[PDB]
C-alpha cells in the first residue's frame, strides 16, 4: 500500500471560533443581497476532505518520463543558487505567520530577537546533523469563502505546515532555488514569471503560432495527494543538479527525507492525527515541487500521446496545453492517451479534459483570455475570470477584517476587467473614503506571496502591470458582459448601472481629497464620466520597486515581500 495518508482518528481541530455564515453589517446589502449563498469552510467538514484525499497511489514510469527528467536535470545543472543568511530569511517571514511552538513568534523573527535567531541556528544545525527523523507538522482546516454551487458546499482544504523555526531554515536552504530554478528548467512554460498581461500575451502568441490550434486544460484530482515519494525524491534530485553550497546540499537532502517526503500530522490540540506520504501544502517547495512534477508528467504524457508542436503553461498543479490540431477526431483520441499516460504517472483527472478550438473558452488558473477595445478602438486581449468567488470574498471582507484582503489582490490582478473596475474599485474605495483609510497599507497575496500595499498606490501599480489601457478599456465582449451580469443576479448584487451611478460619486469624493486620492479618482474612475479626462503616464509609477512581483509562485510558502 502506498496510501497518501493514514489516520489515527483524532480530529482536525480549530485554533479559534470559526464562522461559516456570511457576517452582515450595514454595508453588506449595498454589495450583495443573497447572503445564504456565501459561506466559509471550517474544520466541521475536514472529515469529508480526509476521505477525498486518502487513496492508494500507483506509478508506472516509462522511457518518456525518464527522457524528460534527464532533459530537466540538464537545464537545472546550469543554475547557481545561494544560501540566504538568517537575517535575509527572517525578513521574508510574514509579520502574522504562525508562532513557533518554541517560545517566539513571527515578530521576534522579523526583529532578529536573540531567542528566535538562536533557535533557528539550532534547527539548522539539527538539519545538517540528522537526515532521518521525521519533522513534526500541524494539520489545519483552511477557512475559505465560496459561493454555494447547486450543481452545494466544498469541504475545507487542509494545510500541513512545519514549525516557524523550520520554515526559516527552508528559506535559507531553498528560497533562491525555488525562485530561480523553475524558469531555467521550464523556460516560457513557467507560469509564475508572467504578470496577467504577460500571461495573456504568451497564450495569444502561442495560439497564433499553431496552423490549426487546439488547447486544453488538465485538471488533476487532488494533485497534492497524487504526489508520491518517488515524485518528491525526483524533485530533490533536480534541486541537487544546481551549483549549491555543500551546507545547502545537506539541508535540502535533510528537508527532503524528514519533511518533504512525509511525516506525522499533529492537530492544534497537540494530538497525533496520522501520517502523510504525499505533498505537504504548507512548505516552501509546494509551488516549485508541484510545478516541476506537473511539467515532468505532462511533458512525458505529451510524448506518449504524440501531440504535435505542444506548448505547455504550468503554474503548480494548474496545466494548460496548446498544440497543433490533428483534426477533431484525432484530437479527442490524443487527449484520452494523454490522460491515460498522466494516470499511469499517478496524476488522474478530476473532470476529463476536452479539446478547445476557441482560446477564450480555455480556463486556466481559474482565468481566461477575453477581448475589449482601447481608447483608439484597437482590439486588446486581457485576463478575466468568473467573478463569483471574488464577489463572495468581497462580501465577507465588507463585514470582517481578514489576514488577506482578496479584493485588493483581485483589483491588482484583474484591474482591466469590467467587474473589478465597476464593482470592486467602486465598493472598496467608497468604504475606505468613509473610514478615512486610503493611506493604510493592507496585506494581500499575489502568486501565494504576501504584500503590504497602500490602496492609494493602485493607479501606479496598475499602470506598471497593465499599462494605461487598463484605465481606458471599453466594448467588452457580449460573453464577458453576460457572465458578469449573470453572476450579479445569482448573488443579488446590484446591476452594473447602479455601480456606474455609485462610481461617479466615489470619483467626485476622491477628487475632493486632492493628492494621491484625486489621482485614484482621476485614473481608476475615468470610465464613470461622460467628459473623460486625458490619462497620461504617472511619474510615481516608474519609482515603484516591483521586483519580485511576478518571478515565482510561493503558495503555502510563508513568503512576505514588504
Ligand atoms: O463601448 C462603449 O464605450 C460603451 C460601453 C462600454 O464599454 N462602457 C464601459 C466601459 C468601461 C467600463 Br469599466 C464600463 N462600461
UniProtKB/Swiss-Prot annotation:
Effect of residue 317 to E/H/N: Complete loss of RdRp activity
Residues given in the record as Mg(2+) 2 binding sites: 219, 317-318
UniProt domain RdRp catalytic: residue ranges: 213-331
Effect of residue 219 to C/G/N: Complete loss of RdRp activity
Entry superkingdom: Viruses
Membrane topology: Single-pass type IV membrane protein
Resulting phenotype, residue 285 to V: Almost complete loss of RdRp activity
Cofactor note: Binds 2 magnesium ion that constitute a dinuclear catalytic metal center.
Catalysis: reaction(s): RNA(n) + a ribonucleoside 5'-triphosphate = RNA(n+1) + diphosphate
Known regulation of activity: Activity is up-regulated by PRK2/PKN2-mediated phosphorylation.
Protein localization: Host cytoplasm; Host endoplasmic reticulum membrane
UniProt modified residues of type Phosphoserine: 30, 43
Effect on the protein of changing residue 316 to A/C: Almost complete loss of RdRp activity
Cofactor or coenzyme needed: Mg(2+)
Record note on modification: The N-terminus is phosphorylated by host PRK2/PKN2.
Assembly and binders: Homooligomer. Interacts with non-structural protein 5A. Interacts with host VAPB. Interacts with host PRK2/PKN2. Interacts with host HNRNPA1 and SEPT6; these interactions facilitate the viral replication. Part of the replication complex composed of NS2, NS3, NS4A, NS4B, NS5A and the RNA-directed RNA polymerase embedded in an ER-derived membranous web.
The protein's role, per its UniProt record: RNA-dependent RNA polymerase that performs primer-template recognition and RNA synthesis during viral replication. Initiates RNA transcription/replication at a flavin adenine dinucleotide (FAD), resulting in a 5'- FAD cap on viral RNAs. In this way, recognition of viral 5' RNA by host pattern recognition receptors can be bypassed, thereby evading activation of antiviral pathways.
Protein name, per record: RNA-directed RNA polymerase
Residues of the full protein shown: 2421 to 2982 of 3010
Amino acid at each position: 500500500h502506498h496510501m497518501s495518508y493514514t489516520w489515527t482518528g483524532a480530529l482536525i481541530t480549530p485554533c479559534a471560533a470559526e464562522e461559516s455564515k456570511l457576517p452582515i453589517n450595514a454595508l453588506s446589502n449595498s454589495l450583495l443581497r443573497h447572503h445564504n449563498m456565501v459561506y466559509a469552510t471550517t474544520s466541521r467538514s475536514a472529515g469529508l476532505r480526509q476521505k477525498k484525499v486518502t487513496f492508494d497511489r500507483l506509478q508506472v514510469l516509462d522511457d518518456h518520463y525518464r527522457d524528460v527528467l534527464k532533459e530537466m536535470k540538464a537545464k537545472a545543472s546550469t543554475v547557481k543558487a545561494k544560501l540566504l543568511s538568517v537575517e535575509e530569511a527572517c525578513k521574508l517571514t510574514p509579520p502574522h505567520s504562525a508562532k513557533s511552538k518554541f517560545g517566539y513568534g513571527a515578530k521576534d523573527v522579523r526583529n532578529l530577537s536573540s531567542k528566535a535567531v538562536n533557535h533557528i541556528h539550532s534547527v539548522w544545525k539539527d538539519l545538517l546533523e540528522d537526515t532521518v527523523t521525521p519533522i513534526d507538522t500541524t494539520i489545519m482546516a483552511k477557512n475559505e469563502v465560496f459561493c454555494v454551487q447547486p450543481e452545494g458546499r466544498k469541504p475545507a482544504r487542509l494545510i500541513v505546515f512545519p514549525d516557524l523555526g523550520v520554515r526559516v531554515c527552508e528559506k535559507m536552504a531553498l528560497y533562491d532555488v525555488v525562485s530561480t530554478l523553475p524558469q531555467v528548467v521550464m523556460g516560457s512554460s513557467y507560469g509564475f514569471q508572467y504578470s496577467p498581461g504577460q500571461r495573456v500575451e504568451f497564450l495569444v502568441n502561442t495560439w497564433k503560432s499553431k496552423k490549426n490550434p487546439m488547447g486544453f486544460s488538465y485538471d488533476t484530482r487532488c494533485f497534492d495527494s497524487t504526489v508520491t515519494e518517488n515524485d518528491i525524491r525526483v524533485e530533490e534530485s533536480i534541486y541537487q543538479c544546481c551549483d549549491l553550497a555543500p551546507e545547502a546540499r545537506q539541508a535540502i537532502k535533510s528537508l527532503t527525507e524528514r519533511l518533504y517526503i512525509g511525516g506525522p500530522l499533529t492537530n492544534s490540540k497537540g494530538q497525533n492525527c496520522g501520517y502523510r506520504r504525499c505533498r505537504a501544502s504548507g512548505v516552501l517547495t509546494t509551488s516549485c515541487g508541484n510545478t516541476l512534477t506537473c511539467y515532468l508528467k505532462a511533458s512525458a504524457a505529451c510524448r506518449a500521446a504524440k501531440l504535435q508542436d505542444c506548448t505547455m503553461l504550468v503554474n503548480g498543479d494548474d496545466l494548460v496545453v496548446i498544440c497543433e490540431s490533428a483534426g477533431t477526431q484525432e484530437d479527442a483520441a490524443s487527449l484520452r492517451v494523454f490522460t491515460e499516460a498522466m494516470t499511469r504517472y499517478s496524476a488522474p483527472p478530476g473532470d476529463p479534459p476536452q479539446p478547445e478550438y476557441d482560446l477564450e473558452l480555455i480556463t486556466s488558473c481559474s482565468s481566461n483570455v477575453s477581448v475589449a477595445h482601447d481608447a483608439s478602438g484597437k482590439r486588446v486581449y486581457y485576463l478575466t475570470r468568473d467573478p463569483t468567488t471574488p464577489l463572495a470574498r468581497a462580501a465577507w471582507e465588507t463585514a470582517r477584517h481578514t489576514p488577506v484582503n482578496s479584493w485588493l489582490g483581485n483589483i491588482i490582478m484583474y484591474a482591466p476587467t469590467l467587474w473589478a473596475r465597476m464593482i470592486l474599485m467602486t465598493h472598496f474605495f467608497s468604504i475606505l473614503l468613509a473610514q478615512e483609510q486610503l493611506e493604510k497599507a493592507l496585506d494581500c497575496q499575489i502568486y501565494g506571496a504576501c504584500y503590504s500595499i497602500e490602496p492609494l498606490d493602485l493607479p501606479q501599480i496598475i499602470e506598471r502591470l497593465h499599462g494605461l489601457s487598463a484605465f481606458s478599456l471599453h466594448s467588452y465582449s457580449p460573453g464577458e458582459i453576460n457572465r458578469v451580469a449573470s453572476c450579479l443576479r445569482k448573488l443579488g448584487v446590484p446591476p452594473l448601472r447602479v455601480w456606474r451611478h455609485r462610481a461617479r460619486s466615489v470619483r467626485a469624493r476622491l477628487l475632493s481629497q486632492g493628492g494621491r486620492a484625486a489621482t485614484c479618482g482621476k485614473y481608476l474612475f475615468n470610465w464613470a464620466v461622460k467628459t473623460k479626462l486625458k490619462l497620461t503616464p504617472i511619474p510615481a509609477a516608474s519609482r515603484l520597486d516591483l521586483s519580485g512581483w511576478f518571478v515565482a509562485g510561493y503558495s503555502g510558502g510563508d513568503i512576505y515581500h514588504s
